């Protein structure tokens, strides 16, 4: 054994995990056919991401790390182009054959700011992390096989010799190799069938500026520094712009739009498809009258997947290798920073007692694919609830109660162990959660909401349900859980912007 872990993948997930392992005492090397710099969406940030980014600096004691949670660090360490700013997730909702209405809009506002990461330069930093710590990088190889023993892994690669671990990680994303040698993956089971193309613009008009000011709309916060889910009912579209920061100079905005592929498949080109989105769409029209295109359109016809199992004795895929939903709420990320923070110290465990079953990484998995089934739940049911403005508005505090109590969790885990310095302690806690994978990590109420609300979704969708009596269910769910929420005010439905506090 020449290393102890072998992680394919050199993005942010592979960086990371090889950082902390590195710092940690092991020999680390990190295989990817790409090589940097290069492009990735998963660009919109949550406070759960933001507080997984600081437990894992904190944890392994990596202060870099904790830079990638704050915008305002990034523009300082990683680069001024390197983010955007969001103050929260905001969502417009529209209709084919009538005007769109500021008034059908919804976003719950941060205290803290989050970034929009760009993701060539953040994923790049993130391997100098790694290189700086001691992990080793070859960037532009070909693997030829990657065989599995009871000893070790042996990785054969095109043009050099064979490389030889304890353990490999799958740090890849739907290119995962162990994943396709495995026979793990399936979309079987899956409520979320959907399509996604995105690319990134130049000269994207602000959301105040082609649609309607802050005067007009009444949100706390500009929908330009924010996250903006334009939807309707057979998808959404993202506007997530790099240059809204005010010390920011990256000029280019993310966009990216999903259809649920029950309701429309696109057939022609990409950028056919979005001339026609916005001759449906007018008031999305708007952001794109004097925009050009910065890269080729990617088009994928089908982002959803599962597995069955995603760890063994000498592996495990990490969660873009294991399972993906849809880009809507950006869990993808959470997942990952979480399944880091949670498999790194068994695999120093196993490092250090040289043993590898895959018994010790069954919570690891437990995690991971319990993430994605919520994961699926949450969006399947929330592109039901795109039909309507009345039933979104109502359905997206479900979503944010949920959200909210996860962040407070884990903002508790993380001052614990700011101040007791206790490591085990935390991944014992992390460990010790009731509900592993969901929304609130530890509420019995909020995930009785969560099961509730999702059944009368899927309920709603199976019959055709008339939207009124669907909204009205939801709200009574949410009136009956409020008691054991934070106390924000959700069963409030005139008011569209729930504030903190
Ligand atoms: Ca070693
Ligand atoms: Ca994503």
Redesign the pocket.
């Known amino acids: 054994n020449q ?2 872990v072998i992680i394919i993948g050199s993005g942010i997930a592979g960086a990371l995990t090889g950082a902390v392992l590195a710092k940690s ?3 680390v090397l990190i295989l990817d056919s790409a090589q940097h710099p290069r492009f990735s969406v998963g660009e919109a940030a949550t406070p759960e991401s933001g507080f997984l980014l600081r437990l894992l600096s904190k944890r392994f004691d990596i202060p870099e790390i904790a830079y990638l949670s704050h915008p305002d660090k990034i523009i300082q360490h990683v680069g001024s182009s390197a983010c955007g700013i969001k103050l929260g997730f905001s969502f417009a909702w529209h209709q084919e054959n009538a005007p769109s209405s500021p008034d059908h809009l919804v976003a719950p506002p941060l205290k803290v700011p989050e970034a929009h990461l760009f993701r060539q330069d953040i994923d790049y930093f993130a391997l100098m992390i790694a290189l700086k710590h001691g992990a080793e990088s070859r960037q532009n190889i070909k693997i030829e096989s990657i065989s599995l023993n009871d000893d070790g892994v042996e990785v054969a690669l095109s043009n050099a010799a064979p490389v030889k671990a304890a353990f490999i990680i799958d740090a890849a994303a739907q290119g995962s190799p162990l994943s396709r040698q495995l026979g793990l993956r399936t979309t079987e089971g899956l409520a979320t069938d959907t399509c996604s193309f995105f690319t990134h613009m130049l000269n994207v008009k602000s959301y105040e500026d082609a649609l309607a000011p802050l005067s007009r709309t009444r949100s706390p916060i500009e929908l330009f520094k924010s996250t903006l889910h334009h939807i309707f009912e057979e998808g959404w579209l993202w506007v997530i712009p790099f240059n809204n920061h005010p010390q920011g100079t990256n000029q280019l905005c993310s966009i990216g739009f999903q259809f649920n592929n029950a309701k429309y498949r696109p057939t022609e080109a990409p950028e056919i498809e979005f001339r026609k989105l916005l001759k449906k769409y007018p008031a999305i029209g708007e952001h794109f009258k004097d925009a050009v295109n910065a890269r080729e359109w990617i088009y994928a016809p089908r982002i959803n997947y599962r597995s069955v199992q995603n760890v063994g004795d000498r592996f495990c895929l990490l969660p873009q290798a294991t399972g993906f939903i849809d880009p809507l709420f950006s869990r993808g990320l959470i997942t990952t920073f979480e399944s880091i923070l949670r498999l790194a110290p068994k695999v120093l465990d196993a ?1 250090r007692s040289n043993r590898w079953q895959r018994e010790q990484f069954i919570e690891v998995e437990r995690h991971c694919l319990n993430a994605v089934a919520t994961n699926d739940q949450l969006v399947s049911c929330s592109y039901e609830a795109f039909s309507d403005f009345h039933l979104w508005n109502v359905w997206h505090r479900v979503w944010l109660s949920g959200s909210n109590l996860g962040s407070a969790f884990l903002q508790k885990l993380l001052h614990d162990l700011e101040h007791s310095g206790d490591a085990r302690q935390f991944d014992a806690a992390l460990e010790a959660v009731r509900f592993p994978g969901c929304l609130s990590l530890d509420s019995p109420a909020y995930e009785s909401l969560f099961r509730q609300s999702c059944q009368v979704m899927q309920q709603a969708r199976e019959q055709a349900r008339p939207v009124a009596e669907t909204a009205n269910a939801l709200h009574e769910l949410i009136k009956e859980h409020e008691a054991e929420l934070l106390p924000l005010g959700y069963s409030r439905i005139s008011n569209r912007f729930i504030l903190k506090v």
Do not use: E, P, R, V
């Open positions: 290393y102890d005492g092991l020999n490092a």
